[PDB]
Amino acid sequence: LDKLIRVGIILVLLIWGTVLLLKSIPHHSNTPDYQEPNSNYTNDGKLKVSFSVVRNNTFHPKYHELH
Amino acid sequence: NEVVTREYTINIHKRIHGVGFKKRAPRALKEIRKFAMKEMGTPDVRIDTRLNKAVWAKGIRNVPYRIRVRLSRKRNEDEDSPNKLYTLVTYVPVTTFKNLQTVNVDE
Amino acid sequence: SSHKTFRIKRFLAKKQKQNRPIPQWIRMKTGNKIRYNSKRRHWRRTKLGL
Amino acid sequence: VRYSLDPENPTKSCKSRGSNLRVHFKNTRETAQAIKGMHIRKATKYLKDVTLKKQCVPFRRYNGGVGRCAQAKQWGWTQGRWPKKSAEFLLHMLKNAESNAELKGLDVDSLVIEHIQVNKAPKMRRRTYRAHGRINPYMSSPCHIEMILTEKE
Amino acid sequence: SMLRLQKRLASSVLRCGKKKVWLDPNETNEIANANSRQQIRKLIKDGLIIRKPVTVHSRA
Amino acid sequence: AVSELAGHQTSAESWGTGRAVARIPRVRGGGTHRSGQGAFGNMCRGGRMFAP
RNA sequence: GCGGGCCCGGGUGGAGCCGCCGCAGGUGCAGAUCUUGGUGGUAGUAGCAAAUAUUCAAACGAGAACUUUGAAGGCCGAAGU
Ligand SMILES: [Mg+2]
Ligand SMILES: [Mg+2]
Ligand SMILES: [Mg+2]
Ligand SMILES: [Mg+2]
């Protein structure tokens, strides 16, 4: 019976708290994977900065020859 | 003891001497802060907005040579900061600065 | 371009729908080797050269 | 985890470490060398003075191009700077170590830094754009820092 | 804390440039919860937000 | 035996002299890692084994 | 053991391995401006300097030179920023 009374108390406390404190709350939207997707996107950005750099012809303004 | 108020006339002319045109009024406010810190032993100095307007009245290149300000030390009533007291500097409109001394405004 | 044709609009719509990230519950599957979408497309780089 | 130079008396010693901290390795190493062997209160006071540019950190190994200052005369050295980010990063480490000692049941005002070590962390990669269509790496140099405090007084 | 939306909406409601939009610096909290218009118009009616007069360009 | 096409499926040309590279056929163009890298040689990665 | 190398001791490691008689080879690297990958000195260095300019107070905030609000000083000056 003690467990049941504890459950009742918890439920009433939660209801009171929400009514007098918490703000707007989303119903359910398949709670974002962002908690680990932060590190996943950190690795993804490490991949993104690893994009291939195209080769280029090095400029060199040389002088004249010889005669 | 530490709640006294008094008036000072700061010579901005000899403190902003040799500074650039675009860094003269900000230097004037920096010198006002330094003057308040040196006179009143409070690292926290708050400048009144009207004092800023008085400093900036004639643009950034031309700052008034003399300006008379009130130096008031307060209690910092509610902030739980390491600085126990702070100083408030208020602009005093004055016609002429001749024979004006650092008169202490008794409370 | 605000003057697009129907085919181009359908292509853009399909790309936009494909740009979304991978759902989290995929990671909990038994035989899963995928950690991120790895095919995300941003509009600054990889300019979708139509 | 594994600590290099394990404490001689684990009963009266606390530990603290951090992984992949985005702070320059050379400045942090110099600050750790300067702070090594100090008392905990002295170490905190020295770090706070460094943040206020009242005391400098002597640069002895990585001193190429470092300017000179009068603050370095206290250490018998010429080079010196005032690394702020490194000082804050290892001051948070000092706070964590003090909390660990307090939880473990140790005298906070008797702790000294017996061991402190800074190791290089894997580099983050960014890119910079140069002349004639060239791209060169623009990479961060994070570090791993671990230290052991021992009650010695 | 963040009142760019309110100023942008008040400029459209008053049909001014938002250079003349004056948000009350004291009661910013009451401005903050006015995300939608027709509620900013209520603040205009209350006088919390006013359109400032144009800068004087004398001709004399 | 190894496949006859192993290593020669690429179209690689050797960059001429006047460049810091070492006169080895390299992958032509592209924005890939396998671009200007090296092919057709037994000393190159991927490449082709000597005397298949 | 002249040598090519090899046999034991200790630690880590967790699942296959070696000697001998013969057979076979994609069988031994210091270089080839060799190929691929990684890491140093340079070096906490070059640099973060094209187009006049910012300052004060408050708010949110753990944290404010860079956010927002108000005030002041400026610029773009109807072929306009
Ligand atoms: Mg582009
Ligand atoms: Mg280019
Ligand atoms: Mg430099
Ligand atoms: Mg002009």
Swiss-Prot record, chain B:
Post-translational modification N6-succinyllysine, affected residues: K38, K53, K58
GO MF, one example: structural constituent of ribosome
CDD domains attached to this UniProt entry: Ribosomal_L31e
Annotated GO biological process: cytoplasmic translation
Phosphoprotein listed as a keyword: yes
PROSITE patterns per record: RIBOSOMAL_L31E (PS01144)
Superkingdom field: Eukaryota
Record keywords, A-Z: Acetylation, Cytoplasm, Phosphoprotein, Ribonucleoprotein, Ribosomal protein
Location, primary (coarse class): cytoplasm
Modified residues (Phosphoserine): S81
Residues recorded as bearing N6-acetyllysine in the entry: K58
Cellular localization per UniProt: Cytoplasm
Keyword presence, Ribonucleoprotein: yes
Family annotation (InterPro entries): Ribosomal_eL31, Ribosomal_eL31_CS, Ribosomal_eL31_dom_sf
GO cellular component, one term: cytosolic large ribosomal subunit
Pfam families: Ribosomal_L31e
Function: Component of the large ribosomal subunit. The ribosome is a large ribonucleoprotein complex responsible for the synthesis of proteins in the cell.
Subunit structure as annotated in this protein's UniProt entry: Component of the large ribosomal subunit.
Family: Belongs to the eukaryotic ribosomal protein eL31 family.
Name of the protein in its database record: Large ribosomal subunit protein eL31
Annotated source species: Oryctolagus cuniculus
Lineage, broadest ranks: Eukaryota, Metazoa, Chordata, Craniata, Vertebrata
Gene that encodes the chain: RPL31
Curated annotation (Swiss-Prot), chain D:
Assigned GO CC terms: cytosolic large ribosomal subunit
Keywords tagged on the record: Cytoplasm, Ribonucleoprotein, Ribosomal protein
GO BP field: cytoplasmic translation
MF terms in GO: structural constituent of ribosome
Domain of life assignment: Eukaryota
Keyword Ribosomal protein: yes
Record's subcellular location: Cytoplasm
Task performed by this protein: Component of the large ribosomal subunit. The ribosome is a large ribonucleoprotein complex responsible for the synthesis of proteins in the cell.
Family named by the database record: Belongs to the universal ribosomal protein uL22 family.
Subunit structure: Component of the large ribosomal subunit.
Protein name per Swiss-Prot or TrEMBL: Large ribosomal subunit protein uL22
Source organism: Oryctolagus cuniculus
Swiss-Prot record, chain E:
Family: Belongs to the eukaryotic ribosomal protein eL19 family.
Residues of the full protein shown: 2 to 61 of 196
Positions of post-translational Citrulline modification: R4, R15, R37
Subunit structure: Component of the large ribosomal subunit.
Residues forming coiled coils: none
Transmembrane segments: none
Functional summary from the UniProt entry: Component of the large ribosomal subunit. The ribosome is a large ribonucleoprotein complex responsible for the synthesis of proteins in the cell.
Superkingdom of origin: Eukaryota
Post-translation changes: Citrullinated by PADI4.
Subcellular location: Cytoplasm
Sequence positions bearing Phosphoserine: S12
Organism: Bos taurus
Entry protein name: Large ribosomal subunit protein eL19
From Swiss-Prot, chain F:
Origin superkingdom: Eukaryota
Post-translational modification: Citrullinated by PADI4.
Subcellular location, record wording: Cytoplasm
Annotated positions of the Omega-N-methylarginine modification: R45
Subunit annotation: Component of the large ribosomal subunit. May bind IPO9 with low affinity. Interacts with RBM3.
Task of the protein: Component of the large ribosomal subunit. The ribosome is a large ribonucleoprotein complex responsible for the synthesis of proteins in the cell.
Protein family according to the UniProt entry: Belongs to the universal ribosomal protein uL4 family.
Protein name, entry field: Large ribosomal subunit protein uL4
Organism: Oryctolagus cuniculus
